Amino acid sequence: KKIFKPEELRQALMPTLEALYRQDPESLPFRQPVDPQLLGIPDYFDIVKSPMDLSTIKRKLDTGQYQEPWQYVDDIWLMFNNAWLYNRKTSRVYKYCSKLSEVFEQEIDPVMQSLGYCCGRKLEFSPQTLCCYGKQLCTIPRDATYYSYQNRYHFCEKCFNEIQGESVSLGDDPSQPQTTINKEQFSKRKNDTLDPELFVECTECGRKMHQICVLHHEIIWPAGFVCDGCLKKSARTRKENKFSAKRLPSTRLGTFLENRVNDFLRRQNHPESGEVTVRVVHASDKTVEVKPGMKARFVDSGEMAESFPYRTKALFAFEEIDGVDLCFFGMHVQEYGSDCPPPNQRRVYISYLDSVHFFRPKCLRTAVYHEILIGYLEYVKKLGYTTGHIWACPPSEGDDYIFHCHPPDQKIPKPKRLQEWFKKMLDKAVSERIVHDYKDIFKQATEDRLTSAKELPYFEGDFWPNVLEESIKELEQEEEERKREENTNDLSQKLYATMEKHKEVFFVIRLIAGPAANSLPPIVDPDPLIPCDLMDGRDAFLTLARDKHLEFSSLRRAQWSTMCMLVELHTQSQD
Ligand SMILES: CC(=O)N[C@H](CCCCNC(=O)CSCCNC(=O)CCNC(=O)[C@H](O)C(C)(C)COP(=O)(O)OP(=O)(O)OC[C@H]1O[C@@H](n2cnc3c(N)ncnc32)[C@H](O)[C@@H]1OP(=O)(O)O)C(N)=O
Ligand SMILES: CC(=O)N[C@H](CCCCNC(=O)CSCCNC(=O)CCNC(=O)[C@H](O)C(C)(C)COP(=O)(O)OP(=O)(O)OC[C@H]1O[C@@H](n2cnc3c(N)ncnc32)[C@H](O)[C@@H]1OP(=O)(O)O)C(N)=O
Ligand SMILES: [Zn+2]
Ligand SMILES: [Zn+2]
Ligand SMILES: [Zn+2]
Ligand SMILES: [Zn+2]
């Protein structure tokens, strides 16, 4: 065990502070105990229930009030915090209030490392937005009027105004107990709260180190968290992690993809490259019910099928950066087999694909992405799939597709860039004879001489299924306006117009064409099913990540979130 003598700890940290005093005149407002009256602005010590400055910190060091180094850091952070809040951004104090902390980080993190503390920043997570319980499908917005109760239950600005009357007479749980509460019992606030990062304490230090920074998962090492410094001295090595991505059950598809990538990296012989692991972590058969509009007009009529059976898979690429697993790519696909009703027969469609851009080396990052997406096509081609489908639609502002909370400097590409992005790899696939050719959806329709909406493939979550229901309704009210006026290719037209509107956003990839396309044995996936509820679509994993704060915003947190999700897959595989 180790304890901090005040005068030994001063010696470490005084440089950091005396450096902060040096900023001229950035530090000058911060040098002494700000007092309302004298500074002429009456509400400062009526808003902040605690007061601080450098001199107070400076005295706290010398007198010997600091047991642990984080007290010092927190008080310094508090001084920026409580000052930022008080003054408007456009004022001068605010500007300095950042320039010092900028020095502060630069300086403090290596200084903490000398002390054996891994890092040296006060860290918090993102605004953890909550969710609805009354409407069940809805959610609780951030920085908005919010309603809640008992911390466990949250409700929207529109929720409790028209559910069970003014009084809260609806408390429902799986267990019998119920509850009736009054209208005015609720607690109002605006979601601005920030939840702070957790820490873990070592066996022989008691040191309050970041969970993320030291990367300690309770489950992987239940013996107890030992930091490396203690391990180093005792000549020890943390017992091997068995919850690694490499240790996930292998598959033909996973191995196909991780070889195509790792063979490519070996060709490149780049100095920064490490080996990649590609894993299919969910495989399960499913159905897509035809929508009510198209239902009556077609499946009830006896023209098209009532449902379409497919297979949903979830594959994830990982990389060994600094001897630590890191997930940087994820994908969701829909495989419609040979025992499937047309038009959907022998087709693969990419529901969602996503990434966090920490792949090393950066220069090979995009090329690695293309190799997966090409490898997926080649694989499914070999099984005898014919047509691949992509909806090249980037997410909207603040929306995560798979990985929760991306890095701030990960530029979400504009629809033209992403369009060109796919064009590049398909071009690469075309040259490799993996892909024969491809076209946009509109021109494919023209090529196929399509005459009715039942000849257009129907996929889960696609644009067309949800627009075809809407397109029909426009025609239903079209007659309604017609009849009222009168007193004193029906739907093939509507679609073909919409396809002309959005032609480039949708690809149609022709894996096989012509002679082979006819004489084809049935499709037989050589991989079993992989039941997993966590990776059964994107919403389940985001929820766990939004709840347990598994962010991919930084490298350090992605290394954490990856480790967490890996353990959740190795233990969802335990019944
Ligand atoms: C229903 C509905 O309507 N909508 C939806 C459902 C819709 C359909 C779902 N469809 C799909 O899933 C299939 S399309 C999936 C598109 N996926 C994403 O967008 C995920 C987020 N994007 C990414 O992960 C990446 O951009 C990735 C696509 C993997 C490509 O990364 P990259 O690294 O290969 O290239 P780069 O990103 O172009 O960047 C390449 C260079 O890009 C530069 N750059 C990127 N973006 C920009 C930019 N925007 N402006 C200027 N420069 C920019 C980037 O910084 C960089 O510089 P360098 O590499 O020199 O440092 C819903 N569910 O509601
Ligand atoms: C009389 C008097 O008073 N004063 C003066 C005379 C004084 C004496 C003259 N002294 C000298 O001549 C010797 S020191 C010369 C300094 N000259 C310059 O700086 C010219 C402008 N900068 C550059 O040409 C390049 O940056 C260069 C330093 C040559 C190489 O840069 P790089 O590319 O190898 O590294 P990077 O730029 O640091 O980093 C590049 C990585 O960091 C990036 N990044 C760079 N800067 C920043 C930043 N500031 N903040 C965040 N990120 C940042 C950069 O984007 C990047 O990202 P990536 O990984 O994506 O590539 C007078 N006479 O007027
Ligand atoms: Zn730390
Ligand atoms: Zn609501
Ligand atoms: Zn220790
Ligand atoms: Zn390179």
Task: Please report, for the chain, the start and end positions of each structural domain, with discontinuous segments joined by +.
Answer: 6-115, 129-192, 199-233, 252-572
Helix axes 92-115, 69-86, angle to 10 degrees: 170
The CATH superfamily assigned to 129-192 is CREB-binding protein/p300 RING domain (2.10.110.40)
Tokens of 127: 């605004």
CB-CB contact of 400 with 464 (8 Å): no
User: Looking at this protein, which amino acid is placed at residue 508?
Assistant: V
DSSP 168: B
CB-CB contact of 532 with 541 (8 Å): no
Nearest bound ligand to the CA of residue 207:
5
Give the span between the Cα atoms of 214 and 199, in whole angstroms: 9
- Burial category of 326 from C-beta neighbours within 10 Å (exposed 0-12, middle 13-18, buried 19 and up): buried
| Residue 211 phi, psi (nearest 5) | -60, -50
| β-strand pairing of 387-391 with 347-355 | parallel
Nearest bound ligand to the CA of residue 363:
6
Tell which CATH architecture fits domain 199-233.
Answer: 2-Layer Sandwich (3.30)
Residues 6+ apart with CB under 8 A from 106: none
Way it was determined? X-ray
Give the span between the Cα atoms of 98 and 108, in whole angstroms: 15
Tokens of 499: 């396809």
Nearest alpha carbon, ligand 1 atom 36: 413
**Where does the chain break, by residue before each gap (C–N > 2.5 Å)?**
488
**Cα angle vertex 558, ends 555, 563, to 5°?**
135
Residues 6+ apart with CB under 8 A from 187: 147, 148, 149
The CATH superfamily assigned to 6-115 is Bromodomain-like (1.20.920.10)
CA distances from 85 to 48, 82, 293, 383, 396 (A): 9, 5, 54, 61, 30
Long-range contacts formed by 130-137: CB under 8 A, 24+ apart: 130/154, 130/191, 132/156, 132/159, 134/159, 134/160, 134/163, 134/170, 135/159, 135/163
The string of DSSP letters for 432-471 reads TTS--EEEEHHHHHHHHT--SGGGS---TT-HHHHHHHHH
CB-CB contact of 569 with 281 (8 Å): yes
Which ligand 1 atom sits nearest the alpha carbon of residue 352? 12
Give the span between the Cα atoms of 181 and 185, in whole angstroms: 7
CB-CB contact of 529 with 518 (8 Å): no
Which ligand 1 atom sits nearest the alpha carbon of residue 417? 38
**Residue 136, phi-psi category: left (phi > 0), alpha (psi -120 to 50), beta (remainder):** left
User: Looking at this protein, which amino acid is placed at residue 495?
Assistant: L
Q: Would you say the C-alpha torsion 459, 464, 467, 468 has a positive or negative sign? A: negative
Give the span between the Cα atoms of 170 and 185, in whole angstroms: 14
Residues with Cβ within 5 Å of ion ligand 3? Answer: 118-119, 209-210, 213
Look at the block and give the residue holding tokens 């005084």. Answer: 14
Pocket of ligand 1 (CB under 6 A): 350, 352-355, 357, 365-366, 369, 390-395, 401, 411-414, 417-418, 421
Instruction: Tell me whether residue 28 is annotated as binding.
Output: no
Give me ligand 5 centre to Cα 203, in Å: 6
Pocket residue to mutate for ligand 1, from 334, 351, 418, most atoms within 8 A of Cβ = 418
DSSP 29: G
Same fold? 6-115, 199-233: no
Q: Report the side by side order of strands in the sheet with 276-289.
A: 276-289, 307-321, 324-336, 347-355, 387-391, 506-510, 437-440
Give me ligand 3 centre to Cα 195, in Å: 17
H-helix or E-strand spanning residue 416 = helix 415-431
Give me ligand 5 centre to Cα 244, in Å: 24
